[PDB]
From TrEMBL, chains B, C:
CDD domains: AAD_C, ALDH_F20_ACDH
Family, similarity comment: In the N-terminal section; belongs to the aldehyde dehydrogenase family.
Database matches in InterPro entries: AAD_C (IPR034789), ADH_Fe/GldA (IPR001670), ADH_Fe_C (IPR056798), ADH_Fe_CS (IPR018211), Ald_DH/histidinol_DH (IPR016161), Ald_DH_C (IPR016163), Ald_DH_N (IPR016162), Aldehyde_DH_dom (IPR015590)
Domain Aldehyde dehydrogenase: 4-396
Protein name: Aldehyde-alcohol dehydrogenase
PROSITE patterns assigned to the protein according to its UniProt record, in alphabetical order: ADH_IRON_1, ADH_IRON_2
Amino acid sequence: KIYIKRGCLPVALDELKNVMGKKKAFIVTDNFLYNNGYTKPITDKLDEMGIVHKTFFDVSPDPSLASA
Amino acid sequence: IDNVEKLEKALKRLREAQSVYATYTQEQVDKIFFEAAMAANKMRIPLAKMAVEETGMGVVEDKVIKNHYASEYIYNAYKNTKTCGVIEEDPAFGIKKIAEPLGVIAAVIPTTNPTSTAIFKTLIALKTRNAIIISPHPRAKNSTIEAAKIVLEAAVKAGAPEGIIGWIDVPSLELTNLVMREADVILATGGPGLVKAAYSSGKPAIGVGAGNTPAIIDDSADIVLAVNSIIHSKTFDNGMICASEQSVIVLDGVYKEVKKEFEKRGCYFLNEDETEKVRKTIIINGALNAKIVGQKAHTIANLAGFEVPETTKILIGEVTSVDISEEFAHEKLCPVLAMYRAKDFDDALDKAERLVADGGFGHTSSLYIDTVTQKEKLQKFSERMKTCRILVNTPSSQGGIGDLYNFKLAPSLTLGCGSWGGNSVSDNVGVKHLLNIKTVAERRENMLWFRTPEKIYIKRGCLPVALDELKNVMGKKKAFIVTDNFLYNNGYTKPITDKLDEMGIVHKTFFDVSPDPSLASAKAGAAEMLAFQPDTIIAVGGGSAMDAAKIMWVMYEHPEVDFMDMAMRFMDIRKRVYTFPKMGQKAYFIAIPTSAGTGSEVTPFAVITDEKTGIKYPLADYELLPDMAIVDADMMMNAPKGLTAASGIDALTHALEAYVSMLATDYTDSLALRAIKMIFEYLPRAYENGASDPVAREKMANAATIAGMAFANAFLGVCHSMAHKLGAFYHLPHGVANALMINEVIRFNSSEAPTKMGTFPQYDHPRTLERYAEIADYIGLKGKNNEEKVENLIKAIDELKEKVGIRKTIKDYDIDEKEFLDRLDEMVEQAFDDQCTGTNPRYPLMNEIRQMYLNAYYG
Amino acid sequence: IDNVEKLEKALKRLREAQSVYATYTQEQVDKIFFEAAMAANKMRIPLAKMAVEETGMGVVEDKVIKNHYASEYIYNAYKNTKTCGVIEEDPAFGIKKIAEPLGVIAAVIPTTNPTSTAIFKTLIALKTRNAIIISPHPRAKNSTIEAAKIVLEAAVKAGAPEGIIGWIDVPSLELTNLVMREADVILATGGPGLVKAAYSSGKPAIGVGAGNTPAIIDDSADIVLAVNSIIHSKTFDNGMICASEQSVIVLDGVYKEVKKEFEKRGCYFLNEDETEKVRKTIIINGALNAKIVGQKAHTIANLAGFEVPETTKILIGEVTSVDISEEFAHEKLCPVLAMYRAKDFDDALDKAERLVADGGFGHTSSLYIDTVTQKEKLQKFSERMKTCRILVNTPSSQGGIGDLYNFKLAPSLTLGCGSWGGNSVSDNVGVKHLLNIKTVAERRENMLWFRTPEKIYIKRGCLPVALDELKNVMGKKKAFIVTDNFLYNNGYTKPITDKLDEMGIVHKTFFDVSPDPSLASAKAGAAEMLAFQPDTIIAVGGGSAMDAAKIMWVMYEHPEVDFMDMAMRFMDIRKRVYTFPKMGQKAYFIAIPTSAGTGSEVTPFAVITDEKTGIKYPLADYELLPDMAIVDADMMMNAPKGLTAASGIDALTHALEAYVSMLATDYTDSLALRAIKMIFEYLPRAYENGASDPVAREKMANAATIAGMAFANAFLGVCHSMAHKLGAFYHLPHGVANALMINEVIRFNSSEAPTKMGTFPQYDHPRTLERYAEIADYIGLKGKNNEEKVENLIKAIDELKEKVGIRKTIKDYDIDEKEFLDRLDEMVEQAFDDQCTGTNPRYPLMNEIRQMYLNAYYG
Amino acid sequence: KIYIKRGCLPVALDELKNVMGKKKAFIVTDNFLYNNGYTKPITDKLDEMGIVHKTFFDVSPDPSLASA
Ligand SMILES: [Fe+3]
Ligand SMILES: [Fe+3]
């Protein structure tokens, strides 16, 4: 399930509920990306469905074992 | 305004001023709204006094409360709403919603709320950059004009166009009917007989119904709360406001307590003579009396012909008849109330449903109940009642316009009733019903994908080492081999049967798969597996065997499936009407090919022919991917010359159509080009030398698998839609059927000006000639101007067909001409109705299909 | 069905079937929808062939596309949309929605889309549990009836009622008029005349408008994309589908390139004679020709009188005029096209607006632009175009029915054109337009609050310790003391100034505040504060001092505030029109009382008298809470006897009103009870002894502050509403005015059958008698049946008034009777229109207030 | 600003936007409450108002200094 073309993020994320039925999501991102709000569309989409999400942004470049 | 000509002049000036007001910003609208709200808020007492003096009905204090509500709660509700520009925006898509004013509104005003309704409507018209005509009632015109002037002066002082609000000085039927026919939208609140004209005026309208409001009191309820709420609601403004209780139904077990409380809190119960007098004085000639509305209970009693204590609040009459004959079942805007008795909750529900109909059908109803214990009764009441407002433990008069007792309910003085009441709102009319919503849409492209089966194994002699994965990473102990009779007879399952027997797996084999498999064989195989209870399904053989095994797997794991529903034409594979069931639980599928060019071990296609009509249905869904697609070259050696030629040509056609397809993405173009190069460079060597040249056979198998993936991710074109029918009508092999039509399709797709296009978001213009030129350049014909390259490619394909022993024309395959021309019409009709023609860049018509297929048959 | 009586019988059967259908569950409706979707999708080619053979215009393949669309895309837009029961559920409030069906739909089908529209309407009606009757066009009866049958015999087989779908076999004008008037809703397509009649019927109508569609092409756009999209949309189904590009506007920058691109791909540009012939053949007597719609360009040219190559697609004639007289400016349902030359973007917008307003007002328009580097032009286009659909870089025919080129747009025919075209839709008609939504509302209560100023300091001699915090903690530099003349002249501000001097803080004192503070004193104080710029404000004194200092603080922090706007009456303190500006930006507001019975150090109330009108304007908002209120008994040990008595009685009245308030809660109740007990126990000792009794003075201080808190959190009643006016009209002390009215107000409120009620959700039934009995029981009085207790309470209040030397009646304070009788009518009017009136647990009328005034005067 | 009576949580929380203007919220709660979805009424209103929020739910009975 490799998905291509623009604007495919919400359409691809539709499969989490309609086909798969998942309930809990754990976003792993970067502090630089999280501060500017690069996970905003994903969290907004997961809110449109009955999915609860938790974000973890304590990851640094050259990720060390402590963050893992 | 007392003449027609003045009316057109006023309408013209109002349209001119609205054309200016419609281009204001949010800040100016907020300023005007705030100033008008304050000006209307600080003049409640004089307006109420004027309304009471003019109409001669109602009480001053409740009118003051109504004015305060209509001037303050409206502002508190709609001060923070956005009604100017972009409301909703989704940058991922192209959607953009823009709010625009509605136009010039024509509003009518009743006598029940001469001033509060005018204030509310003027405020909501000012908020939405609209213009309004007020049509005052002939009996209460002065107060309405005064309220309109009060709002208008503040609006124009705040920086609004002068001619925003208009009004009719002396109203008449002709003037109102002319106003209604010219305005864009009509706001009707004047009751029936006028709302019907508004709806039959020829313009969009927003009207209101009204009528009887049943109230239910049952055993599990607070008697004091219910009685006092009913008294408050009924006595608010002498019951003149609509949406107030007109009848109360009390269950049998609490009748005495309710009657005692009603008597204690100051209500007078009528006896038979009093009931007769009251019911005779309420309705005159089948119509509500005009001198009884808004008057006190004492005045009603005096007019009826008797006397009551001066402190009586509600006249209550106990009745039994619910039909229209009873005169207490009618609506009445006065403190007279009717009381009913019920022996059970179902009887109360039946009674209340007769009282809502024929009266306030779709308006409102009330129920007093304990909402913690009696959960089922609440559901039953909610389901049964055909009213747009269902109130629980709330007074009806203040709950119909509810922002006082309940929140998240629109605070409106105009109450729609839905299709039940003969109007089109079904909600409290708010600020969102006076706006137009424009949708701006940007062109977006369809989402694509790239799906392949897992664990694709590519090397010689990999079959034993790969089959070692059983009982190593899994626990499969039962195998069901599906093969062909020819392969089974020559012992081609021996390398697999020996390997399975070496490990601890029992196996059963099925070898009743004829070429062009029939549905009966698939059903027999499914029944055999159902009797055998296998764990994994191994499909060995050519394309027909693998497709038949796929169908058997589908019928084995979901024995309730209907074949005719699966073979169903769809426009978009993601928007299928029929959804294939999930299939991964009862069996594990492995595909081992012996024929090369079919390439069905990496594709979702399972094309099979019918058992009765012999029609080829190409059913395809991504639930059919044969995971663990193993390719072994040593099993691919003993193929005769004809089979190799047909397989090679079929693989070449697969690669060509995958490259030129409309859904062809960049992830597949590389595979298509590589497969085309491989097939062109190595097919003759494998065809002539045979099994003595293992390199050619290995390269041909690899090219076939690559092209299989290529056309698995990108669907075919019209050549396959023609070749399927050609092979089903005259029993020709699939490869040679594809071979005889490729040149015509190449010449058909290559056209700068086609009659029809493919209708795809990303195929924005004909590009097929450039794609074929790219194919020619990659393969190395070195032509000129993108046209000679296509001709060179056609000539090269013809030469390749010559070198592999494919005859030039269909006529050379011993086909009678008369039967050909007799079946041509049916064959064209079936060819157009195929799944493969959907993704073709040109979308061929039937006449073009016939012309091309005749060209291919004649030369 | 070809006669009126047959139609009426059919309508009765339809209603009977819909009544049974309207109670189906979700699973059943899902099954009906699914089976109907298969039935409509399978028979896609036969219906297209039937329609093209019957109608005589159109192309078979595009009709097949439309038939496939109207089933597949409709099914996969609402397959899992909940529409049976509770769709919204908010447990915190009482809101719940039911989404009930609508009833009977009268469908009016056009001739351009006979089958697809019928399938779409039937499916959407089936999904919403409605019943539909179809009135086909006379020219295309059979195809529509056949499509309805194909859907119906599958819906019935799936488990649905029998006569859900009905149709009129032989349509007529009278039959259509009858079926429009007898149906619940009218869903109408087919352009003007029929929609005008549908809206002029008297029933809700959802109608379709139609008209032109201009396509703007500017300098910065893909020429190939724009040209090919326009060609595709225009040639789709020979252009009978609505919203097709009837004109094109191209700027001179790319005019020649666009012309070359059109010429390259199958188009014909007319000359002067051909344009004239085409103009004379499109329009006949100011109307569209019926023999030109749906045919190819070759046939149109043949009827015109010239010849064109058989492969031509579009005929284009260059025109400059854009008025109504031009025959190329109308909407043509044929492949004929008109080209316009525009100097710049503004000229193109002006022309497009003219085409939209003259013709397709509100339908749709198209723009081809670069959406990345032309934001301002795109925004101007979105703002100026008055069409419900605005498509950018999208073909109009496939863009209007949007599920192909843009998602998140409703896939549907039946496009509503909004109030611009004369129909109340302004959207794409879908499922949500065929439902009635019922609102279930449960009784909810307003939230309450407990707001007090921070840092309340309460002991004897705590003033120096409290003021020491001004430097060691906050760090202020400038102080502005406000007091009154008499309090200043006797040196009661000496300790404060001494402490400020010791701390080293510069201070300035303003003391020109007179009793009954006016606006002149407040303005002078604010001017002094502006000139001095203090960092903290210290308000020392009684009632006048705190109110004057609060007004000076407000005018000092926000000098643009109008006083007549803060003095406006509100129903809910949290829903008022005027919002107070935030305070505390500049200075603190420490408050030190020198009397007991005002409570102003803990309340948000202020009151001042205008100099000219001479009437008090109480105002209240929690932005006036004096932070760090200091209550020291040393500052107020030497008050005279009359002031002590008046203050004690005012505090007692505050506590009583706070207890019997509608907004009363436990927090205020405990404080009110304690204050009442302390006032009853210690007031005579303070009055008779004075400074010789410090314990009584301190207890009275604490009781006054506690009562202040109590009536700050819960508002007052009706005694203050008339006491303020009594004190203002005849110049009496506030406590004296309170004393003369509390006894009659207690009896007024104590009533089991009040004329009106306070209309507060928390106040279900009258309970003031029980509250007064609770007060009497807490004090220590004796009685029976909750009435003798209240009588004993009144007697005790009379005894307390007698002890502290307060007279019995108003007339005992030397007020003329003629003056009272000549000012009573104005005094009652002023008293009713007061802020304190709306909180009383018994809504007063004017006559009741006048009667209370007379009883107070005459005893 | 002590707020009482039932159904006052959304009305009180509305002040976070319509009065003050905050933009980031840090919810602190216990394991049991978070697992049983008792913070959902608050997070729903925060999402409706348009306020980013993050939840810490790692507190225990008789809390220690490590959790703080
Ligand atoms: Fe094939
Ligand atoms: Fe007071």
